[PDB]
């Protein structure tokens, strides 16, 4: 049983990267600075401060993955508060919070928000002529 | 890299049960009603409405586990807003949100709050004379790095 | 890990993969986007190909169902650079016995950096993009240099 929810024109974007993937995330943000500047940005750990020092964008801070930030992101997705997830997780290194990694991606699938796990997916999303449009999405009907 | 934090005398307790374990959790609540009435209670899914109908205890409702309730609980644990976790998960059925289940237990371990994963451990915790007093707990010093 | 590039052709090879309770969701999506999908190469796993041929006029390569090896067929072709796009509606509310195949397929789509969608909103962003029917240059691991370092 489905219902609908409205993703707004101006979006709340979560930016999450594993250690060997933080330089890949910062290069992506740099290439799309004017596209990100009017949306709201959040990031786990110190990635936000790295983005801030290199580009000037404001990024709200959350806990690092190992300390709980992935669950912070996931809780907000399910409350309808985060609209997009860019999650450059590391497929070539084992992390102790892998349960948190898979739980967060599970919820981004359940709640049907645009979610990219690599560069080319993130390009298709952020460069799309619809990224700045409101979006009506099908979601589970919790009641 | 450890520091300290104080759990208040009035604890914010999270009550979480999988489907076939719901009955055991409500029996535990009914056995310990006079103790639990002095604490703040939250529960995932409909479990809060079950408790309130059978005891009159006040229970703040959160999303069910499959829809993200375990991660709401984990987020508050890491923020220092939940002080105790009673998690009656089911060891004899497989659930689709198993990563969420293990992720909540990992964080409760990281942030070193009292946590019960079965009936006898829950009785030991809530029956402790220390349970309704302030409790100093060791925690990771995140404000370091 | 050093990077190189490869180019996904204008006509894409798209893998269409869905768990039992998500099959109807995938066919809804295929139905809406049929005028675009007729211009690309399509493969699907298990009974999903029957469903698509029956309900549309699209032609699909049959691959094995997920539990019998189909996810590893798709993964193999991804790593060989033969599959360009992955539409993978897996079920986050039901446990499956081939969950390791499911996670290994998503792991490889991440290493080899191909467009991948796990839900409707992400699938629409990809297929509707004005770039979808043009060559796409993507950054990929440099396998020969990676091998050279392991010796």
């Amino acid at each position: 049983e489905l219902t609908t929810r409205t993703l707004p024109a101006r979006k709340h974007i979560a930016l999450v990267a594993h250690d060997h993937c933080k330089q890949m995330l910062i290069n992506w943000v740099k290439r799309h600075q004017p596209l990100l500047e009017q949306h709201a940005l959040s990031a786990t750990g110190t990635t936000g401060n790295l983005i801030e020092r290199e580009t000037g964008l404001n990024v709200n801070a959350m806990l690092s993955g190992p300390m709980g930030g992935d669950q912070q992101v996931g809780a907000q997705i399910s409350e309808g508060k985060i609209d997009v997830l860019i999650f450059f997780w590391d497929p070539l290194n084992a992390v102790p919070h892998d349960p948190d990694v898979k739980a967060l991606l599970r919820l981004a699938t359940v709640w049907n928000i645009p979610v990219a796990t690599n560069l080319v997916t993130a390009d298709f999303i952020i460069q799309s002529p619809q990224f700045n449009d409101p979006v009506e999405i099908l979601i589970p009907d919790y009641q």
Side-chain angles (χ1 to χ4, degrees), chain A residues 1-57 59-142:
Chain A
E1 271 48 80
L2 310 159
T3 182
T4 77
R5 139 183 305 172
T6 300
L7 296 182
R10 185 194 176 253
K11 279 151 185 72
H12 184 191
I13 304 164
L15 303 175
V16 187
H18 286 178
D19 280 343
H20 293 75
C21 308
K22 297 173 87 147
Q23 276 306 308
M24 179 178 66
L25 179 58
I26 178 77
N27 292 340
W28 182 83
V29 176
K30 248 196 281 249
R31 283 170 40 191
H32 302 106
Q33 295 169 49
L35 302 175
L36 300 165
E37 59 184 334
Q38 103 270 352
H39 296 282
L41 306 180
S42 291
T44 49
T46 58
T47 303
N49 313 39
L50 169 61
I51 296 183
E52 218 286 338
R53 273 154 39 214
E54 215 78 3
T55 69
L57 294 158
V59 190
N60 175 58
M62 300 159 87
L63 295 178
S64 68
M67 291 299 104
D70 287 7
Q71 297 191 49
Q72 289 186 305
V73 171
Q76 295 207 29
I77 298 182
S78 80
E79 285 155 6
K81 291 173 169 75
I82 285 173
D83 309 307
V84 178
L85 171 60
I86 314 292
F87 191 6
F88 291 176
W89 66 277
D90 192 346
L92 294 177
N93 286 287
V95 288
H97 60 294
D98 197 53
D100 306 48
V101 171
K102 304 298 184 271
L104 172 49
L105 291 170
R106 195 186 67 80
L107 280 192
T109 304
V110 169
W111 287 105
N112 192 19
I113 67 159
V115 51
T117 43
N118 62 27
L119 274 182
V120 310
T121 309
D123 277 6
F124 265 107
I125 295 174
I126 196 63
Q127 295 173 346
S128 160
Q130 278 66 243
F131 189 80
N132 278 287
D133 287 342
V135 193
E136 206 74 34
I137 67 164
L138 295 160
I139 59 172
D141 186 332
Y142 183 60

